[PDB]
Amino acid sequence: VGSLNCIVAVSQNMGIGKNGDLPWPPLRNEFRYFSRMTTTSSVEGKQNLVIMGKKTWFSIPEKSRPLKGRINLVLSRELKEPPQGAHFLSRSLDDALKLTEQPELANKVDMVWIVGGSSVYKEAMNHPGHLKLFVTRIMQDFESDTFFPEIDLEKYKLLPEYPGVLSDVQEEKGIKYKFEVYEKND
Numbered sequence: 001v002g003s004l005n006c007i008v009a010v011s012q013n014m015g016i017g018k019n020g021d022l023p024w025p026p027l028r029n030e031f032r033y034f035s036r037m038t039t040t041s042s043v044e045g046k047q048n049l050v051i052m053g054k055k056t057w058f059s060i061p062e063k064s065r066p067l068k069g070r071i072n073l074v075l076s077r078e079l080k081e082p083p084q085g086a087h088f089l090s091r092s093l094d095d096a097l098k099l100t101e102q103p104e105l106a107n108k109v110d111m112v113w114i115v116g117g118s119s120v121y122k123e124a125m126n127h128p129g130h131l132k133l134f135v136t137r138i139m140q141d142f143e144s145d146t147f148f149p150e151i152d153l154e155k156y157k158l159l160p161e162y163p164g165v166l167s168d169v170q171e172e173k174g175i176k177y178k179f180e181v182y183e184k185n186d
């Protein structure tokens with residue numbers, strides 16, 4: 001199994017969601033970037049795995065569920081089986097990561113992408129090991145009810161460049177944003 005990664009878009013006030021949706025209007029190319037990053041695998045005959053909390057799963061439009069060309073794993077202690085359309089269910093992040101090393105998935109999974117929400121990002125982020133954060137900085141404040149955990153910059157280094165990531169300011173629907181890649185290894 002390859003790299004462990006988080007991917008998120010976040011407003012200035014650290015907001016990632018409001019009432020089960022994003023705090024900002026749809027940003028088509030920002031979404032395009034999420035799709036590209038999570039779907040593209042380096043390794044022949046492998047797919048990437050996406051790991052998400054239960055609420056995040058149900059926040060994705062039904063038509064867009066499962067995330068196509070990726071293996072979709074949901075985290076939940078309440079559910080007894082994967083949601084309709086989902087591929088896997090685990091009871092904790094450790095359990096999900098262990099599973100990837102099972103014979104059913106060990107030779108199928110390339111990158112693993114944590115796509116939310118708050119508590120899954122937090123745990124992943126505070127977990128010793130090699131980890132990258134793909135962070136889109138939405139450069140306005142948006143009213144939010146769920147937030148990205150604090151990025152500890154003593155450990156997460158902001159990379160000065162990354163292949164396939166544009167470095168300049170983007171703008172869609174009057175909203176400026178920029179892409180960032182952070183890396184830790186501890």
Ligand SMILES: NC(=O)C1=CN([C@@H]2O[C@H](COP(=O)(O)OP(=O)(O)OC[C@H]3O[C@@H](n4cnc5c(N)ncnc54)[C@@H](OP(=O)(O)O)[C@@H]3O)[C@@H](O)[C@H]2O)C=CC1
Binds near residue numbers: 009021055076117146
């Ligand atoms: N802007 C962005 O880039 C992103 C925005 N979002 C948005 O943010 C909101 C984020 O949702 P959020 O409220 O944080 O919820 P989550 O997606 O983390 O879902 C929370 C629920 O997932 C299960 N769960 C979470 N963590 C674990 C775990 N470690 N083990 C087992 N089960 C777990 C549920 O458990 P159980 O069934 O056990 O009660 C828990 O109540 C979403 O509604 C979405 O719109 C999400 C990702 C990215």
Ligand SMILES: COc1ccc(OCCCCC(=O)O)cc1Cc1cnc(N)nc1N
Binds near residue numbers: 060116134
């Ligand atoms: C879980 O977070 C998301 C899941 C889906 C999504 O829509 C993208 C296009 C439709 C699905 C596909 O076919 O890939 C958007 C998000 C939120 C999100 C947005 N942007 C970034 N950079 N990270 C995210 N997690």
